[PDB]
Design a protein around this ligand. Structure first.
Ligand SMILES: [Mg+2]
Ligand SMILES: [Mg+2]
Length: 299
């Protein structure tokens, strides 16, 4: 009985092997196979691609801890987004739901409830002790829960407790649950990101990196405020060049969003990957160049 699946792939980024010792198709397959010896829950299929394996676990959490200590072990790899495994029960198609149990200071209770609300979660139990904390229990589709561990930890300032586990399958919620609405900012080249470019770009959305970040072509470097994707230049600037042509301000950069693995997984769409190394997490389009992406969308 498995509930979520994703693809574990060899890291083909221009940066492969620069951060983790273990990068082979062989080494990854060997390591997955080894995991299957003590993980009853886990399923690993070879695919029509020698560099890609479809991995299925009890849920996203289980896949993520596996990715996380492959990281620790020196592995480099790319993963596709966690997809829930729909199942046809009777005639209707249904999706997995989890039970989440939370324990929070009352101070955080409103925010946490709101957030789970927004992720299509259903209040089942609410139980204050009289000492300032409160237990909540929700039932939420797996699809909507992905990403919440990190949200919860941040919004609770690390004081909250969270436990989630597969409950059951039920009729599918409607819509783009867990699905990013915005577009991404994609780097058009390889090099060192500079503040003079980032300064202009941060007007366009929210950046994932800052001055001095080493970047390649196809790497996703931020969130676009509009729904469409933007191929941008973060190696040299144009905004201040334009500013002097009227006014001038001082270059000040908003701190970048730093994303946990779980968040990177929540964020990416079908055409992207999370690049994962022992010391770094990156996001990229599957097709690294703008030329490739254009070709894909055309017929
Ligand atoms: Mg998503
Ligand atoms: Mg989108």
């Amino acid at each position: 009985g498995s509930t979520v699946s994703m693809f574990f792939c060899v890291n083909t980024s221009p940066f492969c092997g620069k951060e983790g010792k273990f990068v082979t198709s062989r080494q990854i397959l060997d390591r997955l196979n080894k995991e299957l010896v003590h993980n009853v829950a886990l399923r690993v299929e070879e695919t029509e691609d020698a560099d890609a394996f479809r991995v299925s676990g009890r849920g996203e959490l289980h896949l993520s801890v596996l990715i996380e200590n492959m990281r620790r072990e020196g592995f480099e790899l790319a993963v596709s987004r966690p997809k829930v495994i729909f199942r046809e029960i009777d005639g209707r198609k249904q999706e997995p739901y989890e039970n989440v149990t939370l324990d929070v200071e009352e101070q955080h209770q409103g925010s946490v409830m709101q957030a789970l609300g927004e992720r299509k979660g259903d209040l089942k139990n609410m139980n204050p002790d009289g000492k300032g904390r409160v237990r909540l229990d929700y039932v939420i589709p797996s699809r909507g829960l992905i990403g919440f561990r990190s949200e919860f930890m941040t919004m609770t300032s690390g004081t909250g407790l969270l436990y989630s586990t597969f409950s059951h399958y039920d009729d599918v919620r409607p819509g783009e649950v867990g699905q990013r609405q915005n577009g991404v900012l994609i780097s058009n080249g390889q090099g060192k990101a500079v503040a003079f470019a980032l300064f202009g770009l941060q007007d366009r959305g929210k950046l994932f990196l800052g001055h001095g970040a080493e970047v390649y072509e196809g790497q996703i470097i931020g969130i676009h405020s509009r729904s469409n994707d933007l191929t941008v230049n973060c190696l040299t600037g144009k905004k201040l060049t334009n500013m002097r042509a009227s006014t001038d301000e001082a270059v000040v950069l908003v701190p970048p969003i730093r994303m946990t693995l779980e968040q990177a997984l929540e964020f990416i769409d079908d055409d992207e990957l999370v690049e994962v190394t022992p010391t770094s997490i990156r996001i990229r389009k599957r097709h690294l160049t703008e030329n490739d992406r254009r070709r894909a969308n055309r017929a």
